[PDB]
Amino acid sequence: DGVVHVLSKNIDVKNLQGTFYEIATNASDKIFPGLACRCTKYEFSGLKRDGNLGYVLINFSCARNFIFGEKKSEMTFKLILNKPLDENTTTVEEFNASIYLVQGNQQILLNGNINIIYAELNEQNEFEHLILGGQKSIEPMIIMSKYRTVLLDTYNKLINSLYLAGYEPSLLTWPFIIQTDQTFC
Amino acid sequence: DGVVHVLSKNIDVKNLQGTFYEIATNASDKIFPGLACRCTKYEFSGLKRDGNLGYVLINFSCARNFIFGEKKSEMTFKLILNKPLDENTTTVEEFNASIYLVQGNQQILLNGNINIIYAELNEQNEFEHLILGGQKSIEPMIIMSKYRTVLLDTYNKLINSLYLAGYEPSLLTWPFIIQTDQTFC
Amino acid sequence: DGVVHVLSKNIDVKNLQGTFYEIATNASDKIFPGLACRCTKYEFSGLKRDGNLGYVLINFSCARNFIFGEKKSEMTFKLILNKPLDENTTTVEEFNASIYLVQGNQQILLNGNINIIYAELNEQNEFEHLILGGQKSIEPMIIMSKYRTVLLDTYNKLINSLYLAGYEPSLLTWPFIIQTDQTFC
Numbered sequence: 162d163g164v165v166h167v168l169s170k171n172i173d174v175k176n177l178q179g180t181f182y183e184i185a186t187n188a189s190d191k192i193f194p195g196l197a198c199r200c201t202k203y204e205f206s207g208l209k210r211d212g213n214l215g216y217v218l219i220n221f222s223c224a225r226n227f228i229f230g231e232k233k234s235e236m237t238f239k240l241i242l243n244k245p246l247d248e249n250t251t252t253v254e255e256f257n258a259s260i261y262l263v264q265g266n267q268q269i270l271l272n273g274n275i276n277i278i279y280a281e282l283n284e285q286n287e288f289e290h291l292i293l294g295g296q297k298s299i300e301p302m303i304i305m306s307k308y309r310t311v312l313l314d315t316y317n318k319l320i321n322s323l324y325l326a327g328y329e330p331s332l333l334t335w336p337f338i339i340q341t342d343q344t345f346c
Numbered sequence: 347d348g349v350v351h352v353l354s355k356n357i358d359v360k361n362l363q364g365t366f367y368e369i370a371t372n373a374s375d376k377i378f379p380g381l382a383c384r385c386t387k388y389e390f391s392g393l394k395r396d397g398n399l400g401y402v403l404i405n406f407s408c409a410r411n412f413i414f415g416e417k418k419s420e421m422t423f424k425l426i427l428n429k430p431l432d433e434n435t436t437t438v439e440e441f442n443a444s445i446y447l448v449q450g451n452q453q454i455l456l457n458g459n460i461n462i463i464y465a466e467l468n469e470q471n472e473f474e475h476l477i478l479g480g481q482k483s484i485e486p487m488i489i490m491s492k493y494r495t496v497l498l499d500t501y502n503k504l505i506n507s508l509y510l511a512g513y514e515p516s517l518l519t520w521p522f523i524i525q526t527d528q529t530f531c
Numbered sequence: 532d533g534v535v536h537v538l539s540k541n542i543d544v545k546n547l548q549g550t551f552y553e554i555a556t557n558a559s560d561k562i563f564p565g566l567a568c569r570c571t572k573y574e575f576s577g578l579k580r581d582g583n584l585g586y587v588l589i590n591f592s593c594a595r596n597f598i599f600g601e602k603k604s605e606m607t608f609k610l611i612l613n614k615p616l617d618e619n620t621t622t623v624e625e626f627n628a629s630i631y632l633v634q635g636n637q638q639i640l641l642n643g644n645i646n647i648i649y650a651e652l653n654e655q656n657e658f659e660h661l662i663l664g665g666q667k668s669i670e671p672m673i674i675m676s677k678y679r680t681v682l683l684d685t686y687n688k689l690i691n692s693l694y695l696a697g698y699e700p701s702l703l704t705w706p707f708i709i710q711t712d713q714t715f716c
């Protein structure tokens with residue numbers, strides 16, 4: 162029925178810090194091709210608190226494209242957890258947030274329900290791979306990773322996560338999954 | 347000149363039983379895209395006799411496609427050997443048959459000349475790979491296998507069989523050979 | 532700024548002899564698709580002298596294409612070094628030449644500046660890989676090799692040479708780099 166559910170629960174938001182490189186996106190006009198230019202990169206601030214409200218900043222940037230004439234690009238997002246977070250814990254049962262475009266002290270609400278679908282920790286308890294998506298299989302979906310490239314082994318595991326989460330098999334193939342160019346970055 | 351000839355002769359029709367998964371087809375409108383949906387599968391009845399007439403039933407099925415809105419699909423074929431078969435042998439010099447669409451006790455002739463071009467046996471004398479085709483290089487052609495996927499090693503061997511059979515090199519590349527989606531089946 | 536410069540200097544023109552197979556070209560209408568048909572092949576005469584003028588003949592050929600109806604094709608080029616060459620040396624600091632179409636004792640000037648961008652020698656001091664290109668990143672560019680295919684390892688090294696020479700990253704991906712069909716030749 163296309164309803165996607167979260168796979169990775171009881172996530173530690175303190176670990177939600179550092180740089181992640183976009184590996185692939187789906188073809189939602191909300192994020193594609195705008196957020197899928199070459200060398201696309203996401204820096205996460207890690208948890209900040211505004212009382213019982215938890216949130217995280219994301220700095221997006223990507224490189225120019227000579228053959229397409231596109232200049233380089235950068236913008237900032239804020240992810241606000243929809244459920245209050247206790248001031249005694251940095252762990253949420255599921256990561257469900259609203260997303261804002263931010264500039265200076267201005268913010269504009271983009272979407273009320275962005276989820277961390279899947280999250281994998283390496284052997285040092287740092288995030289290796291993150292998948293972000295909506296509540297339906299045709300809403301924006303992004304695969305990002307700690308390194309610019311992943312082995313084929315790894316990529317097929319990440320695609321299998323989307324299947325287990327409820328994405329239909331015919332959506333898990335091009336032109337509905339598109340890989341981001343990370344060469345020469 | 348595009349005339350294709352059979353490579354694999356003296357075939358045992360008793361071994362023509364079990365399930366085979368479609369790996370690739372050519373682009374003949376007779377079979378593509380109708381018989382090339384995801385998870386396409388062929389069950390062979392193995393030899394049946396109607397006097398000196400030999401034949402085999404094939405149950406086709408494939409899975410639905412959400413993004414294309416296609417429902418799942420299934421139909422039945424009958425392959426009738428064109429040459430009489432002696433009641434004392436299950437082996438033909440070449441497998442040359444007419445193909446019918448079948449439903450209940452009704453049948454409709456589709457094509458008078460379908461051949462087994464290539465057939466490979468594993469070390470237990472079971473069929474591992476089958477290629478079915480016509481008498482010309484632009485007539486329907488199907489590659490099927492005992493498993494859902496084959497190694498690259500193996501796939502290049504099967505493509506080389508089509509070259510040895512008379513298929514022109516420029517037909518052995520996309521968009522003239524198309525691979526079937528066998529993931530998540 | 533798209534200006535490409537030569538990487539490989541102090542090249543020995545005596546070694547510029549033998550057969551090379553085209554691996555990929557860019558999409559310049561000057562050479563694509565004309566010089567990129569299947570089984571495309573280049574025979575180099577090795578250095579000839581006309582006084583202090585050095586030059587080399589190149590015989591191009593490629594195979595027919597049944598599905599496209601194209602007949603086989605062959606033609607001859609002459610590469611004339613633009614700088615005089617001393618009669619005591621077979622080595623140039625850079626290989627910069629004009630290119631002519633040749634037939635019988637007739638010649639027609641095609642382009643005044645064709646360069647050897649990159650050249651790699653194997654362990655026997657023979658050319659293994661050659662990249663030929665212009666003075667801008669959107670002028671014709673051809674990758675050729677001593678064998679019909681190269682390992683992925685090797686191909687990524689050759690693409691990295693074009694980046695170091697000044698080709699923009701967004702030009703080093705399809706549809707701006709196109710691979711030549713070398714199967715069944």
Ligand SMILES: COc1nc(C(C)C)ccc1-c1cnc2sc(N3CCC(O)(CN)CC3)nn12
Pocket residue numbers: 191192195203219238260262271272275293294295301302303
């Ligand atoms: C999973 O989803 C998202 N993930 C991210 C990162 C955390 C990886 C950012 C954004 C979305 C998103 C979801 N729904 C919408 S609308 C929108 N805007 C794009 C920026 C714009 O200025 C140009 N098109 C205006 C529209 N972004 N998103």
Ligand SMILES: COc1nc(C(C)C)ccc1-c1cnc2sc(N3CCC(O)(CN)CC3)nn12
Pocket residue numbers: 376377380388404423445447456457460478479480486487488
């Ligand atoms: C090698 O060839 C074939 N192999 C097979 C299997 C044994 C793998 C089946 C069928 C052909 C075939 C050859 N010539 C035609 S016409 C046709 N029909 C498709 C079913 C239809 O109901 C929808 N298009 C009506 C038309 N099938 N074939």
Ligand SMILES: COc1nc(C(C)C)ccc1-c1cnc2sc(N3CCC(O)(CN)CC3)nn12
Pocket residue numbers: 561562565573589608630632641642645663664665671672673
């Ligand atoms: C690197 O560049 C080239 N390398 C080669 C080989 C040494 C690999 C040959 C040619 C060029 C080239 C450069 N600028 C032009 S124009 C042209 N002609 C193609 C033949 C034609 O008869 C049909 N289109 C008339 C036009 N070839 N070239």
Ligand SMILES: [Cl-]
Pocket residue numbers: 223224225233
């Ligand atoms: Cl940039």
Ligand SMILES: [Cl-]
Pocket residue numbers: 225226227228699700701702
């Ligand atoms: Cl670029």
Ligand SMILES: [Cl-]
Pocket residue numbers: 191271272
């Ligand atoms: Cl949105």
Ligand SMILES: [Cl-]
Pocket residue numbers: 310311312315
């Ligand atoms: Cl990996």
Ligand SMILES: [Cl-]
Pocket residue numbers: 335338339340341
């Ligand atoms: Cl892609």
Ligand SMILES: [Cl-]
Pocket residue numbers: 408409410418
């Ligand atoms: Cl189904």
Ligand SMILES: [Cl-]
Pocket residue numbers: 329330331332410411412413
């Ligand atoms: Cl599906």
Ligand SMILES: [Cl-]
Pocket residue numbers: 376456457
């Ligand atoms: Cl038919």
Ligand SMILES: [Cl-]
Pocket residue numbers: 495496497500
């Ligand atoms: Cl295999």
Ligand SMILES: [Cl-]
Pocket residue numbers: 520523524525526
């Ligand atoms: Cl394909």
Ligand SMILES: [Cl-]
Pocket residue numbers: 593594595603
């Ligand atoms: Cl030929």
Ligand SMILES: [Cl-]
Pocket residue numbers: 514515516517595596597598
């Ligand atoms: Cl051909």
Ligand SMILES: [Cl-]
Pocket residue numbers: 561641642
């Ligand atoms: Cl030119």
